[PDB]
C-alpha cells in the first residue's frame, strides 16, 4: 500500500508524511461553504490485490490556523458526514486494486459569527489529516500523515 499526491510526491510503504497545497475559493459569503476537496489530490493503491485486502480509515482530522479560528464544518467520507475536527475514527474504505484510487475526503467549512477580513492566509497550515491503513493479512498498521496548506488568501465579508 502506498499513496501519492497529484504533483507526484509519494509516501513509501510503511507510512510517512507529505504536504498538500490546495486552491480555494477567494471569497466565501456568510452562510456559505468553503469546499476543500481532497479526492482530486490524494491517491492510494494496493500492491498485492491477489492475496491481501487493505482497510483505510481517517483516524484523525485537525484544524489549524485560520480554519481553527474562523470556521466550523464537517468531513465527508465514504457514505456519511462527520464533525470536523473529528471526535473519533471513521469506518473503512477497502482498497483492492493495483491501480490508484482517490482518497474520498472533503471538508465543508462555513464561517462562524465574528469572522471577517482575511480568514485564511496564503501558505498557512489549515489541517492535518491522518490516514490509517490496516490489512487483512498480518498485523501491519501504518499511519500516512497529510498536511494541508492554503495556496491563496480567503476573505469573508463583514
Amino acid at each position: 500500500f502506498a499513496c501519492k499526491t497529484a504533483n507526484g510526491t509519494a509516501i513509501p510503504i510503511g507510512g510517512g508524511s507529505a504536504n498538500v497545497y490546495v486552491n480555494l475559493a477567494p471569497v466565501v459569503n456568510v452562510g456559505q461553504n468553503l469546499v476543500v476537496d481532497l479526492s482530486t489530490q490524494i491517491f492510494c493503491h494496493n500492491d498485492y490485490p491477489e492475496t491481501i485486502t487493505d482497510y483505510v480509515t481517517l483516524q484523525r482530522g485537525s484544524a489549524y490556523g485560520g480554519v481553527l479560528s474562523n470556521f466550523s464544518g464537517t468531513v465527508k467520507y465514504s457514505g456519511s458526514s462527520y464533525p470536523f475536527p473529528t471526535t473519533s475514527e471513521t469506518p473503512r474504505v477497502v482498497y483492492n486494486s493495483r491501480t490508484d484510487k482517490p482518497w474520498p475526503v472533503a471538508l465543508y467549512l462555513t464561517p462562524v459569527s465574528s469572522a471577517g477580513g482575511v480568514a485564511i492566509k496564503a501558505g498557512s497550515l489549515i489541517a492535518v489529516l491522518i490516514l490509517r491503513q490496516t490489512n487483512n493479512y498480518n498485523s501491519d498498521d501504518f499511519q500516512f500523515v497529510w498536511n494541508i496548506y492554503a495556496n491563496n488568501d480567503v476573505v469573508v465579508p463583514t
Partner: antibody, heavy 125, light 107 residues
Framework: EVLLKQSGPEKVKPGASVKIPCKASGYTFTDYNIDWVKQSHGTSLEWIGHLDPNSGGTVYNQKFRGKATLTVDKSSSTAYLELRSLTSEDTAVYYC??????????????????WGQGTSVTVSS | QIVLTQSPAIMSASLGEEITLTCSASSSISYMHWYQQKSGTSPKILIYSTSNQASGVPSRFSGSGSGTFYSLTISSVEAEDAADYYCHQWSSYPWTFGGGTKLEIKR
C-alpha cells in the same frame, strides 16, 4: 439580457460628497456579488471593494477605507458607491461589475464577468 | 501589496502575426487573469485561471505562466485586437491590476 446601468457623469465641489447607483437587471440579483473598480488617468485600474447583496457585507481595500462605503438595496436590485470628501485625486471613472465570487464554483470561474458603463466624476470649483 | 508589472507599455504587431504579452509579479501567486478594454468601452474578461478562455472568447487567445511570471498570447492578430490589456490577481489581498499594455497594428 444581463445589464448593469449607472448614472451619468457628475461634477462636484471639493469637500462635497457624491453617491453613484448601479442597477442590475436580467439576472437574480442575489445570486452574485458586486465589485467596484476605479480607473484613473485613463490607464490605472484599481479595486475599491467587494459587496455581498444577501447580507450587505463588504470587503474594502485599505487604500479606500475612509473614502468609500458600499451599500445595497435588495428591493430594487441596486448597489451604491459613496465617496465622502472629494478632492482633485478623486477624479476618475468608477465602474460597478458583477462577480461570480462568493460561492464555490465547480469550473473555477471566479471573475468580474459583466461590467457597467462607468460614471465619470469631475471635482472642480 | 503585490505589484504586477507589464513590459513594455506599448507593443506592435502586423496582421496575422503571433505576439506575446507579458506580466510579471513581485511575489508568487497561483493564478493570473487577463482583461481586455477596447477604446471607449468597459474592461472585459479574456482569460481566467491562467489558461481558460472565457465564454465566447475566440480560441486564438491563450495564456501560460507560473510563479512570478505569466504571459498572454495572441496567435494571429486581427484588426479588432487593438486595445489595452491588463493583468489581474486575486490570489493575495488586496487584489491588484497591472499597468496595462497597448497593442498597435502595423499596416
Amino acid at each position: 439580457e444581463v445589464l448593469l446601468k449607472q448614472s451619468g457623469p457628475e461634477k462636484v465641489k471639493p469637500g462635497a460628497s457624491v453617491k453613484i447607483p448601479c442597477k442590475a437587471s436580467g439576472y437574480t440579483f442575489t445570486d452574485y456579488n458586486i465589485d467596484w473598480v476605479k480607473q484613473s488617468h485613463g490607464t490605472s485600474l484599481e479595486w475599491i471593494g467587494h459587496l455581498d447583496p444577501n447580507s450587505g457585507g463588504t470587503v474594502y481595500n485599505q487604500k479606500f477605507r475612509g473614502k468609500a462605503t458600499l451599500t445595497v438595496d435588495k428591493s430594487s436590485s441596486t448597489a451604491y458607491l459613496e465617496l465622502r470628501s472629494l478632492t482633485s485625486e478623486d477624479t476618475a471613472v468608477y465602474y460597478c461589475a458583477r462577480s461570480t465570487m462568493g460561492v464555490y464554483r465547480s469550473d473555477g470561474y471566479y471573475a468580474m464577468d459583466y461590467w457597467g458603463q462607468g460614471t465619470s466624476v469631475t471635482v472642480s470649483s | 501589496q503585490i505589484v504586477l508589472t507589464q513590459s513594455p507599455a506599448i507593443m506592435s504587431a502586423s496582421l496575422g502575426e503571433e505576439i506575446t504579452l507579458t506580466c510579471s509579479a513581485s511575489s508568487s501567486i497561483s493564478y493570473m487573469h487577463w482583461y481586455q478594454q477596447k477604446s471607449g468601452t468597459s474592461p472585459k474578461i479574456l482569460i481566467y485561471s491562467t489558461s481558460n478562455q472565457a465564454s465566447g472568447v475566440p480560441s486564438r487567445f491563450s495564456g501560460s505562466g507560473s510563479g512570478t511570471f505569466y504571459s498572454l498570447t495572441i496567435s494571429s492578430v486581427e484588426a479588432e485586437d487593438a486595445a489595452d490589456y491588463y493583468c489581474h490577481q486575486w490570489s493575495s489581498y488586496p487584489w491588484t491590476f497591472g499597468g496595462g499594455t497597448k497593442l498597435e497594428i502595423k499596416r
